[PDB]
């Protein structure tokens, strides 16, 4: 089997991407944030505290003839941005782009933090990291991809995120028309439960390439590119008027400035992030200060190749016995 679904930016800045997912019988379609940095499929639901729901579409398990309570199961998760959610668990039928998993753990939110409430466009998350990170207790549950894997034509999924435009998640096949050149594959460590890999270096604009190992994670659920402070300083030093603002919480720049591209290495191959991808607009309405899309990972404890980086590439998440990551230009 295979599946193929369109993923759409939630706003004009590509702050996140939502993908429609069918849950239950008859189908309840929710727009979920596909997150290769986590491993829980959780949804706004009829069980979510009423005051914490504000425009989201909810899953109502009592209206699904295939829903079954996973008795005694609870879940609770926190994300890198300080957001969180928790609740209980049902198993149900879940379909993505024509690909169906029966008995998928669907984690129903009883509580969500304010950032989730305040984002009306995201109805939940669909985690695509390794199932070892899944938070369900007492019995850890498998991700949608892990459940589908054995049925798939090939044990892979791909992320093809758009810049200010829709893109595609495919399951079970590699669309050879979706990228240019070749796909370069690179080793993955699953020891932290992430799609963790090592970039071979970087360049800023037309500058020479710096060969240096940068260990990080391929994370579709993180908006920006977070790299070591040295690398980030070297980037913004090439932007007239750019500065790191502690009050804003990162690098900002006057949008009268022209942003250079940023290149990162995948083995001997190179992915070029165009400068425009690094502009996240005014820090507040009407401000002449813009927020940068490349920021320091210092104090995160890990480098994160988030959407800013991934949307410059066609990315293969290869779930073979020894997982690997593939990157192509597009
Ligand atoms: O928290 C996240 N990323 C993130 C955000 C900020 C920083 Cl410094 C680091 N990481 C994240 O992956 N998600 C997915 C759902 C909404 C939040």
Curated annotation (Swiss-Prot):
The active site is at 35, 199. Its EC number is 3.4.23.22. It catalyses: Hydrolysis of proteins with specificity similar to that of pepsin A, prefers hydrophobic residues at P1 and P1', but does not cleave 14-Ala-|-Leu-15 in the B chain of insulin or Z-Glu-Tyr. Clots milk. Disulfide bonds join 255-290. GO terms for biological process: proteolysis. Residues 17-328 form the Peptidase A1 domain. Keywords: Aspartyl protease, Disulfide bond, Hydrolase, Protease, Signal, Zymogen. Coiled coil: none annotated. The keyword Signal applies. The keyword Disulfide bond applies. This is Endothiapepsin. It comes from Cryphonectria parasitica. The lineage of its organism: Eukaryota, Fungi, Dikarya, Ascomycota, Pezizomycotina. The gene is EAPA. The chain holds residues 90 to 419 of 419 of the full protein.
